[PDB]
Structure 1
Amino acid sequence: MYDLLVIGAGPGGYVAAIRAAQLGMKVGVVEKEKALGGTCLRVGCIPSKALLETTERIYEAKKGLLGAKVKGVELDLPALMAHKDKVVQANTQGVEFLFKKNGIARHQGTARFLSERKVLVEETGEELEARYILIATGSAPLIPPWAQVDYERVVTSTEALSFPEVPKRLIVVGGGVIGLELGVVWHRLGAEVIVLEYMDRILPTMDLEVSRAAERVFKKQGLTIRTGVRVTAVVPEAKGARVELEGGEVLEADRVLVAVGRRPYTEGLSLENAGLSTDERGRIPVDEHLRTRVPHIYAIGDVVRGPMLAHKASEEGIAAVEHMVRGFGHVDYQAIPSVVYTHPEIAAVGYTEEELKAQGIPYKVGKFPYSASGRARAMGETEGFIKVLAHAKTDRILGVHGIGARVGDVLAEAALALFFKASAEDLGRAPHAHPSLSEILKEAALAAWERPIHL
């Protein structure tokens, strides 16, 4: 039998499988979709970043380039979508390559538990046994009952990656990362975009300061952002769709993207046959080693608690399989960055000010603006900042947060510093290339420690 059977071939599942193979396990993977790579590769991170990177270049050329006159920039939607598809194709084929290289067996079908040690692949009729089972079934779009999604006029993120033309009017229901990113993609191509959010801010996982800054920037760019608004219905119409709000207001658009969250996905898994159940939010409860209540069955990624991120899922996959083989594993949740791939980028790592205040932890704030950065100035960027939060007594970095050009790339270093349990002093004293955006992080760190040089 298998040593490890993995259900799902997303970031969590497929990386777990490769690591397990590296540890000497005989591994099988069941995935119901034809291509490997999960939500992230097929309809998530990869296609969305393809669209974001390319539209960003297009948008900047349309606004004008410093030192030049651009005579014309015409969207070529077939070419834009072809690039997206080619990037996805290359990535999924890469996972296939790595499975074959690492000797990982793959089954195509919906895995369903028969017992705690046996799983049916419903399509092939195969019954598979394993010593360890790793549930990595991911998530799915949350579709509230009031949202009548027809996958045409009222859509999820998947269809929003592939609109057959630019929507004259797009409404995004939900002010989270996914909807905002896709809102920006189509706004750059000429769509009038309106974002509706029930909560009193967008990007709720970010530090409040960063959420507020993000809203200002996107409004300046020309998106309409409306927080504190409860959508009561979304209904398709003949050649568009309407969005009803609490109080009677009705908005009309050509497409409406329903992006109010994602829910852990366990449909068709028959968890009950393994002696398992989901909690109130649909998650599979796990302990600190990612074991369910049945000790040889682990769960990771979007199907369990924690930030619904690809690299969160993969790190949990690594820790789970390392625990299976060695009896020890661990994920440093405080070193996992969360990034929004708009321009400017928006990011968070470690604790927000809100979380520190709630936990009663005393801290110092260090902040350095992009306006004081030589490199940012050189690029024609002036807006944004990075903020370092450090413990008031120990100087330990507790969190790093920012908004600005490439801030996600810059905060890669911040995540490393957190992983290294760095002090603000040590981050700020470390050499940083001049002139570079990393110097913004350096000065922010110095400011948290004591004082910066350049403020």
Structure 2
Amino acid sequence: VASYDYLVIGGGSGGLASARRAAELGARAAVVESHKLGGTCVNVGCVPKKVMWNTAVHSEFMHDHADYGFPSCEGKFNWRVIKEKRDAYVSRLNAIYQNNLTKSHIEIIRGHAAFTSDPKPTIEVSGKKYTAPHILIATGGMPSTPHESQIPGASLGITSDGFFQLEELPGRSVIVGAGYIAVEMAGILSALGSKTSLMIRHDKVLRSFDSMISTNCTEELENAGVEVLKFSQVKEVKKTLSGLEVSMVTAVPGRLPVMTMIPDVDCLLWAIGRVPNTKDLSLNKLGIQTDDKGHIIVDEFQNTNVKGIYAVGDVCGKALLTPVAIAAGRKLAHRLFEYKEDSKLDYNNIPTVVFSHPPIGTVGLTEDEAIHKYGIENVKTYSTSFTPMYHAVTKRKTKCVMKMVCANKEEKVVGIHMQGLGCDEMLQGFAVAVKMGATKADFDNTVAIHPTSSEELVTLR
């Protein structure tokens, strides 16, 4: 049993970030990874997704070419040209992160980890045992798929992972789900030329965001050509002579349910959720607590119910974002190796950007969350809706919507929500401001930058 000061199971964002900060503090650490370093962020998530979003953005700009005085570009998008460049980029990143581990003197144990029945917390990787007084589980999650028991032929569809393996643009695609991944995938596929349908159980997408955003995002999708199939779900999928045939039930409230067949579908993408990766860890051997979904339960300091064992990242099921896994992982390293017992991540006011078209930026409470928390009498919102100056000379149009949620007499800014061109790079700074407890007065006392879309947030009345 080789002993270390820190043993990290999982080589994705949470695992790498924590192991590296620990090593900086003098800890002898090792990272166990059964696949590719970089985890979801580098391999099947953030990075490849963003490259595809930049490609989709090129598509929209090509539509505005003639309006801006240029000749019209012909069209024919070549998927494998970008797929190949994207894969290469991911390869460069895997090499970079491996190098980052070596320079910090972090040992990389390649294989699948699983706990043993040994009294003191110990894991086994390919017949060898390893132990440490501090062990971090940062194994992440997977895309969830329906069981063939409830949805016959469900296994004919692909998940976000499968999306990154596609070597050709699907001519006809149906995305199932109403969360951010679904919206993002539908947005890229449609912009790139696929006949796209987004199938959602209710009437709007991103229903957990502020209502102004769910409403506006749903409309922008339709304006951009995406067919949103409302109150609809898949009943069954089957393989026909050319493509898949999807049977769906549409049940609009106050109407009779109707069955519809969607034929000649090239790509069915399930974007319905994420399942934690814990089933094969043998958690039970140490009695480590998990909820009924398989998420490891942790306290505010990322401690599990077992001493010396912690968890961060997607495996815990809360705030499933790369920067959150990273910050929690680093705060933990400082707590254990710099003895700062007050070191932990504040899960409040975590900013998020959804790479839709236009992108969405959000931080803080939605209007409904502020109302519940402070009371209708104490919540004041400010909003604006305008057409960005970029579209002043174009036939194609998009809108920019912004909303500020203030609380109490001082009008403390407790939430900012927006969708529009440039919102992806606009959010970070306002998030710093909200994290500092800015009031509407602080925003108003900052001189605006003209001409930009961002100046609208400091000139709301």
- Give the TM-score of the pair, scaled to structure 2: 0.90
Look up the match of 1:335.
349
Look up the match of 2:65.
64
Look up the match of 1:162.
165
Aligned with residue 145 of structure 2, among 123, 143, 146: 143
Look up the match of 1:392.
408
Is the Cα contact below 8 Å between 1:168 and 1:192 reproduced in 2? yes
TM-superposed CA distance for 1:2, in Å, is 1.3
1:197 aligns with 2:197: no
1:119 aligns with 2:123: yes
How far apart, in 1, do the equivalents of 2:344 and 2:29 lie? 21
Residues 296 and 394 (structure 1 numbering): CA distance in 2 closer, same or farther, change over 3 Å? farther
Aligned identity (percent) is 30
Look up the match of 1:240.
243
How far apart, in 1, do the equivalents of 2:77 and 2:161 lie? 21
Aligned with residue 182 of structure 1, among 173, 185, 201: 185
How far apart, in 2, do the equivalents of 1:89 and 1:317 lie? 24
1:49 aligns with 2:50: yes
Is the Cα contact below 8 Å between 1:381 and 1:405 reproduced in 2? no
SS at match of 2:197: strand
SS at match of 1:268: coil
SS at match of 2:417: strand
TM-superposed CA distance for 1:7, in Å, is 0.9
Runs of 5+ consecutive residues of structure 1 not aligned to the other structure: none
Deviation digits for residues 66-102 of structure 1 (CA, Å, limit 9, x no counterpart): 2212242321222110121122122222211211121
Q: Provide the alpha-carbon RMSD of the alignment.
A: 2.1
TM-superposed CA distance for 1:425, in Å, is 1.7
Q: Superposed, which structure 2 residues align to 1:304-383 within 5 Å?
A: 304-325=316-337, 326=339, 327-361=341-375, 362-371=378-387, 383=399
Deviation digits for residues 97-153 of structure 1 (CA, Å, limit 9, x no counterpart): 2111211111111110114521111xx322110111111111111112135454xx5
Aligned with residue 249 of structure 1, among 260, 274, 299: 260
How far apart, in 1, do the equivalents of 2:201 and 2:319 lie? 20
Look up the match of 1:230.
233
Matched residue type, 2:98: E
Deviation digits for residues 275-318 of structure 1 (CA, Å, limit 9, x no counterpart): 20311222111111111111321111111132211112112112
- Give the TM-score of the pair, scaled to structure 1: 0.91
How far apart, in 2, do the equivalents of 1:159 and 1:302 lie? 19
SS at match of 2:96: helix
Is the Cα contact below 8 Å between 1:198 and 1:228 reproduced in 2? yes
How far apart, in 1, do the equivalents of 2:111 and 2:53 lie? 32
Is the Cα contact below 8 Å between 1:198 and 1:231 reproduced in 2? no
- Comparing 314-323 with 279-288, greater Cα deviation is found at 314-323
1:280 aligns with 2:281: no
Is the Cα contact below 8 Å between 1:334 and 1:418 reproduced in 2? no
TM-superposed CA distance for 1:216, in Å, is 0.4
Is the Cα contact below 8 Å between 1:370 and 1:440 reproduced in 2? no
How far apart, in 2, do the equivalents of 1:382 and 1:190 lie? 19
How far apart, in 2, do the equivalents of 1:273 and 1:378 lie? 65
Residues 226 and 358 (structure 1 numbering): CA distance in 2 closer, same or farther, change over 3 Å? farther
How far apart, in 2, do the equivalents of 1:83 and 1:14 lie? 25
Is the Cα contact below 8 Å between 1:335 and 1:416 reproduced in 2? no
Runs of 5+ consecutive residues of structure 2 not aligned to the other structure: 250-257
Residues 354 and 295 (structure 1 numbering): CA distance in 2 closer, same or farther, change over 3 Å? farther
SS at match of 2:27: coil
How far apart, in 2, do the equivalents of 1:103 and 1:227 lie? 53
Residues 26 and 402 (structure 1 numbering): CA distance in 2 closer, same or farther, change over 3 Å? same
Is the Cα contact below 8 Å between 2:386 and 2:399 reproduced in 1? yes
Look up the match of 2:222.
219
Residues 240 and 375 (structure 1 numbering): CA distance in 2 closer, same or farther, change over 3 Å? closer
Structure 1 segments, 4+ long, off by >4 Å, are: 373-382
- Comparing 73-82 with 48-57, greater Cα deviation is found at 73-82
Matched residue type, 2:313: G
